[PDB]
Design a protein around this ligand. Sequence first.
Ligand SMILES: COc1ccc2nc(C)c(O[C@@H]3C[C@H]4C(=O)N[C@]5(C(=O)NS(=O)(=O)C6(C)CC6)C[C@H]5/C=C\CCCCC[C@H](NC(=O)OC5(C)CCC5)C(=O)N4C3)nc2c1
Ligand SMILES: [Zn+2]
Length: 197
Amino acid sequence: MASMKKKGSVVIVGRINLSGDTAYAQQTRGEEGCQETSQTGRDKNQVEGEVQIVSTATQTFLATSINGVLWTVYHGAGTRTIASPKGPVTQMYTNVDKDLVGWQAPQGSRSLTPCTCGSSDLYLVTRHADVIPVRRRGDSRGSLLSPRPISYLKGSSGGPLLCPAGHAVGIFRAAVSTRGVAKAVDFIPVESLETTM
Ligand SMILES: COc1ccc2nc(C)c(O[C@@H]3C[C@H]4C(=O)N[C@]5(C(=O)NS(=O)(=O)C6(C)CC6)C[C@H]5/C=C\CCCCC[C@H](NC(=O)OC5(C)CCC5)C(=O)N4C3)nc2c1
Ligand SMILES: [Zn+2]
């Protein structure tokens, strides 16, 4: 019992900048600082933007602020705390049945607005700042207009699907593939988040 370890915190290591004319990834912390922040849970870096790049000791993925909650996937974060300036912060939402977790949105982040447009013309934002057109096909499904190898989507779970107006429509959860080519995506609809709150 004395030699039992504690898993580290999720750590913000960068962001996807959607501010201006061009989307681009920014890194805010390197691997050594990430590993240390994961163990202490103390992250004093300023946070900005809507889409964060996050990492554990073993995985990296995305997390998206909607309505004052930083949302991501359970298969990335598990039940882990997130590092913050005052120490590890416990999850405010955990739903393994939805592959969904959330923490209070960090001070300085901006939140996306939940979409009420009812539009089926969506855009998936990846960890490489690709903005991928996706046609909505169901409550939790959308097809890529231009399929591509799943490699290009790996590490983007927790990223947003946006409507034409830039509202949040869902959180990227899984990729549907044939012969390694992603033809469709599975996502947590924003309404499932809004119900969870
Ligand atoms: C443990 O407790 C839980 C609870 C509920 C869970 N619920 C789901 C649906 C789940 O699925 C896992 C993880 C997810 C994934 O891989 N997600 C993306 C991703 O990027 N992760 S990641 O960031 O790299 C990483 C791992 C965090 C660091 C976007 C994926 C990108 C590429 C796919 C790669 C090949 C995989 C193709 C696969 N496909 C698929 O399952 O399709 C369907 C059958 C499911 C409905 C249709 C797929 O996508 N996943 C498999 N695990 C759960 C686990
Ligand atoms: Zn909208």
